[PDB]
Write a protein that binds this ligand. Structure first.
Ligand SMILES: Cc1ncc(COP(=O)(O)O)c(CN[C@@H](CO)C(=O)O)c1O
Ligand SMILES: Cc1ncc(COP(=O)(O)O)c(CN[C@@H](CO)C(=O)O)c1O
Ligand code: NA
Ligand code: NA
Lengths: 252, 394, 394, 252
């Protein structure tokens, strides 16, 4: 499929930036998570970045660490995550869906089998948090064979060689964590989405203004979940409110 | 790209978030430079000798082997400053940190032995040290915790995940990810992302080099086998390294069998785990059918690393080294035997290695064999543990 | 009559019941013979090197002395097998016991360090070992007690008198009085009836011999002073011996000042006691105006011997050695300082010696001086003690 | 004085052996101790061996160790012991009185002063438990200058040289702990008294039969004290009974 390509094309025709929220699948429960995800979509999320709970998320901060704790407390497994993914896609045919995975869960029962499963449920991309470009070959290859976009993080200091590799290896979008944006475009990298720290509407407008195709809210969404655990209803209401504001900030 | 091969066969690699690669590459470069710098080597040799106490003794155990054709020597890392072999490589890594102009040290620890070693090296070399330790471990390691603080180190409990060593391992990396410009991550075993398995081996290889010189001096030949416990793999690879090219010398690594392999409660991922990717490396892991990482269980706190160094997985795959396991009860019996017959109180970790040598001896008492067991640490720290068990069992 | 002078000036002698004289004479004879037997010396040297870990390191302490004209080295007896210098002479005495055809060992211990050393030597050399320990001491030394038993020794609590070290000392003698035919009394310090002060010094003199060779190697000259704590006097005389004829080398013995000499609660009989006759010798004693023997008080369990070796009293009288005292608080501060600035946890006993060197340095920071402190033992054993105090004082 | 010489002369004229009980001065209290001592004398003790409580009696067994504990519990000091000695002698002019001392108490404030004090209160001998003949010179000399008999223990294995020294150095009596007895007489040693284990009448008769001038009951008396602490009256009654029996066994 070409969901990311189709999405960015449309956002461009509207001089619009993309807003992509991240949430942990199954947090705080499978049922509430499916409701949380439908609310993010209804509120205007252009794409989704979904995490699969992993025992040792050595690339995540406290907020996400706790999201996983909550998901595991609910008994969430990768298998259930893939069942949720199928349900999500069945309800929303065009929104791009990207997974944020840890290498072991992809490698566990065969890298190829994992991407084949991603393709089957309708996932569009996979960012493997602990697989640098240097170790990415088998992952990138399996992804491409299964029409899955392999996504890479372009770190702050990314030297030229890295910029070139990320531009050459990535698809869908480049996870950006001016010159950086110019070089990525110069090397024809997948559209860059600004991540990290994106937690306010003004940051979304600033990212698009800097040249990025959009912004990813890596943890602001999870915080809202964590704060309203007491009232599921208020949780969704606040999620809807935040995403609405964030997305609106991306418009021209 | 790298200067050195990050893999041992299919095992190893650098499976870290992109943001950490510069730190690994920087470290690998400094290490390669240090290794070719006679001045660095002389400074490291000086600290090992005049501060840590090397060379350590090689003690023959006639009382234990009497009546059999086994000759057993114990490489005395229990006599190294700090009470365990950990001290060797923390001094080398601390010197590396300084060579890179770093002023701070980050370390992870389970049993607290490596934490104590990192703290003492940092105290000696003027480095500000912070140690991550799983909350469950801090709880059962208050003596080592206090030692770390007396030495000026900051001890930070980790409550995430299972609150054990693997969790402290993640937190260390997380920290380093944003501070490597001024802080060096002093990993405690021969595992993790390259260049760590390589650096730890090289900074522990004097164990085997000394053992070889000492055994040649005393017996006029190489050992038939060298035996070492394997938690993460540092003391064992330290003992094995210099003997790898001596094909006649068996290399036997001993993983904790805990309550028994069949019970599932053990810490033997190399022979009873499944290859996975975690802690920056591809190696045999203690993990669920699902791919979630689990803990290693053992009566010994120090054999808690839920994976094993990639070089051991590699030496095992080609048949150069053999790995076995020893249960809690077998390790306890070796612990008692060594105390009573040699007046040496061994660490419970090391007791697993001695227990296997005792089995090689006892199963075939008339087999002529020259064995060396790496006594990775002293067991004063395990006296309470052993006491309770023996008392509990009446 | 005797082969060797039982006195050091007016101090020493053999003040034991007549029934014990044959045992002392027998022991003196075997010792004189052993000392002239190259085979005995080679066997003792072999155990010291390959089992105990000698030579021990001589560690320079630049972090501690920075900014001053003091250069400080620590003789690392804390790295000796067992964790203290006690191990040296128990191995020599155990070999002597065997030379005399004895199969059993009797020992006294206060802190339990000597008891543990006697047990490990007995375990290694196949001697049946029984240890007398004052009931108050067994109570506060259960870790060392258990060690002694793990090593196969019989630990016998002494409830008579104050139930401390002096009481264990009497009980040991009582026992030996009726068993010397088959048992050797392994006295733990350089005190008691001749030949013990002499034997203990000779079996500890490698401390000073190594220190001299190490200091000449590293500084090209002898130290301006060697400093050692003094409980009974064994680690100090062990360090002092080889330097006695080097008149330029100061010999400074440090007695525990406890809460302060003026409070009366201390363990400094050499400089603040009165000569008496007890434990088979004439020497400065902690005693009432009436002549009843009292206990020595100190935050450190190991400086509890209520008297002091006769040779120290003698070296003090002629002005060859100088004795000073260090309080509990001064020893605690040196303990903390060494942990934080050198990553070495010293025994609280040894901390008294380091505390005095720190005073020599700090009081006259521009005085050029090369000092060696005998670090008689490691302080892992004192971690609980220090913890509580620091916590108690908030 | 010549109390021991006068005593043995008399016992010889009666072909009688001497019986000498040992007790710790001040055990269990000064008052009861004075009563215990008068009872031993009334019951037939030919001489007394009296111990002065010492903190570290490294030459004594459990029984005596406990006697000292009791004496110290009562606050007994050497000074009080010397006051008791004066009272004892003032009541009994001819019985020989020997002290069993530890070296420190003799040396403490001057060896000469100690023997001078012994002479002043009327003590006849002093056995210093932890002063072998080899270290005895100053003690022996001070004793003789003050008309105090220095007593020495002749151990089981005493070789010839020791026998000769003990014979030459001792006075009053030799504390024996056939050949031994013959050699002592041969070297003109002070009359030998058999000690250790003397706890029954038959042992007293056996000692005299072997050639010894008598027997010393080193601890049997203290045991009786220890057993009847509950009833002072019964204590003295039993003491009287035992000593009567022991002394009777010494008669011809
Ligand atoms: C005496 C001794 N012997 C063996 C081991 C096992 O590790 P190794 O396999 O790396 O040698 C340890 C590990 N200790 C680790 C993990 O708990 C630490 O943080 O201290 C040890 O302390
Ligand atoms: C580390 C260390 N340093 C110093 C001393 C003091 O004795 P020393 O003066 O004989 O050297 C001791 C004594 N220890 C004695 C008395 O308690 C024992 O029985 O163990 C010690 O254990
Ligand atoms: Na492991
Ligand atoms: Na003393």
């Amino acid at each position: 499929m070409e969901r990311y390509e189709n999405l960015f094309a449309q956002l461009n025709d509207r001089r619009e930036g993309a807003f992509v929220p991240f949430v942990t699948l199954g947090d705080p429960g499978i049922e509430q998570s499916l409701k949380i995800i439908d609310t993010l979509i209804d509120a205007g999320a252009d794409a989704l970045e979904l995490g699969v709970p992993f025992s040792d998320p050595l690339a995540d901060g406290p907020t996400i660490q706790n999201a996983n704790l909550r998901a595991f407390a609910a008994g969430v497994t990768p298998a259930q995550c893939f069942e949720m993914l199928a349900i999500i896609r069945e309800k929303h045919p065009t929104i791009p869906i990207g997974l944020l995975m840890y290498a072991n869960l992809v490698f566990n029962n065969g890298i190829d089998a994992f991407y084949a499963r991603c393709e089957q449920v309708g996932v569009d991309s996979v960012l493997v948090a602990d697989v640098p470009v240097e170790e990415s070959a088998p992952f990138r290859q399996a992804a491409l064979r299964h029409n899955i976009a392999p996504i890479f993080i372009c770190p702050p200091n990314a030297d030229d060689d890295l910029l070139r590799q990320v531009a050459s290896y990535g698809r869908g979008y480049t996870y950006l964590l001016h010159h950086l944006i110019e070089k990525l475009k110069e090397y024809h990298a997948a559209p860059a989405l600004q991540g990290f720290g994106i937690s306010s509407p003004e940051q979304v407008s600033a990212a698009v203004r800097a040249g990025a195709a959009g912004a990813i809210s890596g943890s602001a969404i999870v915080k809202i979940i964590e704060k309203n655990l007491a009232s599921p209803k208020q949780m969704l209401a606040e999620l809807r409110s935040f995403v609405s504001a964030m997305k609106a900030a991306s418009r021209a | 790209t790298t200067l050195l091969n990050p893999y041992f066969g299919e095992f190893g690699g650098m499976y870290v978030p992109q943001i950490l690669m510069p730190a690994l590459n920087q470290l690998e470069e400094a290490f390669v430079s240090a290794q070719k710098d006679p001045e660095f080597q002389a400074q490291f040799a000086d600290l090992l000798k005049n501060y840590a106490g090397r060379p350590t003794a090689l003690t023959k155990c006639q009382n234990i082997t009497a009546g059999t054709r086994t000759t057993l020597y114990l490489k005395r890392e229990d006599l190294l400053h700090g009470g365990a072999h950990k001290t060797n490589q923390v001094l080398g890594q601390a010197l590396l940190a300084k060579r890179m102009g770093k002023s701070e040290i980050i370390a992870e620890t389970g049993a607290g032995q490596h934490g104590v070693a990192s703290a003492l090296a940092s105290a000696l070399l003027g480095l500000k040290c912070r140690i991550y330790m799983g909350a469950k471990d801090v709880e059962r390691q208050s003596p080592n915790v206090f030692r770390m603080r007396l030495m000026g180190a900051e001890v930070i409990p980790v409550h995430s995940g299972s609150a054990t060593l693997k969790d402290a391992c993640n937190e260390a990396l997380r920290d380093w990810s944003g501070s490597y410009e001024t802080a060096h991550y002093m990993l405690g075993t021969a595992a993790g992302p390259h260049p760590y398995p390589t650096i730890v081996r090289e900074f522990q290889r004097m164990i085997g080099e000394e053992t070889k010189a000492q055994i040649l001096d005393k017996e006029g030949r190489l050992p038939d086998a060298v035996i070492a416990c394997v938690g993460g793999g540092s003391n064992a690879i330290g003992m094995f390294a210099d003997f790898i090219n001596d094909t006649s010398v068996g290399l036997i690594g001993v993983e904790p069998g805990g309550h028994g392999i069949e019970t599932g409660e053990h810490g033997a991922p190399l022979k009873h785990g499944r290859v996975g990717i975690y802690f920056g490396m591809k190696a045999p892991m203690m993990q669920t059918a699902d791919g979630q990482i689990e803990e290693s269980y053992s009566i010994s706190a120090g054999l808690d690393f839920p994976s094993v160094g990639p070089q051991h997985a590699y030496l095992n795959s080609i048949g150069r080294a053999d790995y076995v396991s020893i249960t809690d009860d077998e390790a306890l019996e070796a612990f008692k035997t060594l105390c009573r017959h040699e007046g040496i109180i061994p660490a419970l970790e090391s007791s697993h290695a001695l227990a296997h040598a005792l089995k090689m001896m006892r199963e075939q008492p008339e087999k002529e064999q020259l064995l060396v067991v790496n006594l990775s640490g002293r067991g004063d720290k395990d006296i309470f543990t052993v006491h309770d068990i023996l008392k509990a069992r009446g």
